[PDB]
Amino acid sequence: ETEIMVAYGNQPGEPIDKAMHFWADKVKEKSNGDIVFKLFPSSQLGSETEVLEQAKFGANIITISDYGALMDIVPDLGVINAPYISQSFEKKSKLLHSDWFKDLSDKLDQHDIHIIVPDVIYGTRHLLTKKPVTKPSDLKGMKVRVQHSRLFLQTINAMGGVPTPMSLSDVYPGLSEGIIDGLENPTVVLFGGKFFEVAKNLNLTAHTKHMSPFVAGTAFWNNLTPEQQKIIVDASREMVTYGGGLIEQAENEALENLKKAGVTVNDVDLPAFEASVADVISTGFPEWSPNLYKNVQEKLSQF
């Protein structure tokens, strides 16, 4: 049999974890045992960035990644989750099957990473902080954690905070030790990581409707048979639809779970938060093609 390790940062029982189990079961079933996934939640194989490195070098790994992270390699991918670019997961899904996207995925393949599935719904990212945040000025001097992603570092800087890059597994002790004052993620990820134990203000900035790729190194992926590849990709499509079902009410459920555990939920000045990123989306990523955000904003509109 062909064993593949699946890596992500989410805790057991979270939507992404349930989706990966769905994917694993389906691949095992369709391949009659020839393809098996072994799941590694909670960053067990290492940090998200570290695992991408292991994959690129040929490890038998499929790992969640991030478009904002992948923009180190193919810059234009980073616009997919650019702040406030679209409120619609469905329109993003369409974008992620467009020729504009295909060409970027083909570019990434030549840099030794392959996107197997591009459009897993991860959820709507919100700030979780020690003190309430309702407008950008409230982030003044606040050390807000971001993952290793150029897109989110620049977004949090534009929003008014002090972006502090760190791996997901270091966030909880970072909050507890006072190294950082908050982070951002979807409710299901904030609840799963128990970050509510050390940061009790959920501020509904809703800055990213986050789409997730799962990727493998081209040097491992290309040495799979075409038949194995197709089983994995066919199954991944069903996994996306299944996860869409999981996430539909899971984000509200987690919102309620957060409140029950003592988190205060703050509405924010959304027009002020959207305004705060107007410069950064236009000229803050000099490596982007000219007018990329507005181009994609508009593509998303034909949908």
Ligand X SMILES: O=C(O)[C@@H](O)[C@H](O)[C@H](O)[C@@H](O)CO
Q: Which stretch binds Cl ion (CB under 5 A): 2-10, 48-56, 95-103, 205-213?
A: 48-56
185 binds, among ligand X, Cl ion, none (CB under 5 to 8 A by kind): ligand X
**Does residue 42 interact with Cl ion by CB under 5 A?**
no
Work out how close the CB of 212 gets to ligand X at its nearest, in angstroms, rounded to a whole number. 4
Rounded CA separation 294/167 (Å): 31
- Out of 2, 49, 229, 257, point to the residue binding Cl ion (CB under 5 A): 49
Task: Consult the annotation and say whether 50 binds a ligand.
Answer: no
Task: Consult the annotation and say whether 145 binds a ligand.
Answer: yes
Q: What residues numbered 28-57 form the site for ligand X, per CB under 6 A?
A: 48
Work out how close the CB of 144 gets to ligand X at its nearest, in angstroms, rounded to a whole number. 12
**Does residue 47 interact with Cl ion by CB under 5 A?**
yes
**Does residue 155 interact with ligand X by CB under 6 A?**
no
Helix (H), strand (E), coil (C) string for the chain:
CEEEEEECCCCCCCHHHHHHHHHHHHHHHHCCCCEEEEEECCCCCCCHHHHHHHHHCCCCEEEECCHHHHCCCCHHHHHHHCCCCCCCHHHHHHHCCCHHHHHHHHHHHHCCEEEEEEEEEEEEEEEEECCCCCCHHHHCCCEEEECCCHHHHHHHHHHCCEEEECCHHHHHHHHHHCCCCEEEECHHHHHHCCHHHCCCEEEEEEEEEEEEEEEEEHHHHCCCCHHHHHHHHHHHHHHHHHHHHHHHHHHHHHHHHHHHCCCEEECCCHHHHHHHCHHHHHHCCCCCCCCHHHHHHHHHHHC
**Does residue 17 interact with ligand X by CB under 6 A?**
no
Q: What residues numbered 193-232 form the site for ligand X, per CB under 6 A?
A: 212
49 binds, among ligand X, Cl ion, none (CB under 5 to 8 A by kind): Cl ion
Work out how close the CB of 29 gets to ligand X at its nearest, in angstroms, rounded to a whole number. 26
**Does residue 134 interact with Cl ion by CB under 5 A?**
no
Work out how close the CB of 32 gets to ligand X at its nearest, in angstroms, rounded to a whole number. 31
In one-letter notation, the amino acid at residue 174 is G
Q: Give the interface size with Cl ion as a residue count (CB under 5 A).
A: 6
- Out of 54, 147, 201, 212, point to the residue binding Cl ion (CB under 5 A): 147
Task: Consult the annotation and say whether 125 binds a ligand.
Answer: yes
Site mask, ligand X, residues 257-286, x = CB under 6 A? ------------------------------
By DSSP bridging, strand 61-64 and strand 201-217 are antiparallel
Rounded CA separation 175/296 (Å): 35
Q: What residues numbered 54-83 form the site for ligand X, per CB under 6 A?
A: 64, 66
Q: What residues numbered 156-185 form the site for ligand X, per CB under 6 A?
A: 168, 185
**Does residue 218 interact with Cl ion by CB under 5 A?**
no
**Does residue 48 interact with Cl ion by CB under 5 A?**
yes
Task: Consult the annotation and say whether 147 binds a ligand.
Answer: yes
**Does residue 184 interact with Cl ion by CB under 5 A?**
no
Task: Consult the annotation and say whether 185 binds a ligand.
Answer: yes
Question: Which positions ≥6 away from 152 have C-beta within 8 Å?
Answer: 68, 146, 163, 184, 208
**Does residue 9 interact with ligand X by CB under 6 A?**
yes
Q: Which two tokens stand for residue 96?
A: 């992620």
Site residues for Cl ion per CB under 5 A = 47-49, 147-148, 167
Site residues for ligand X per CB under 6 A = 9, 48, 64, 66, 122, 147, 168, 185, 189, 212
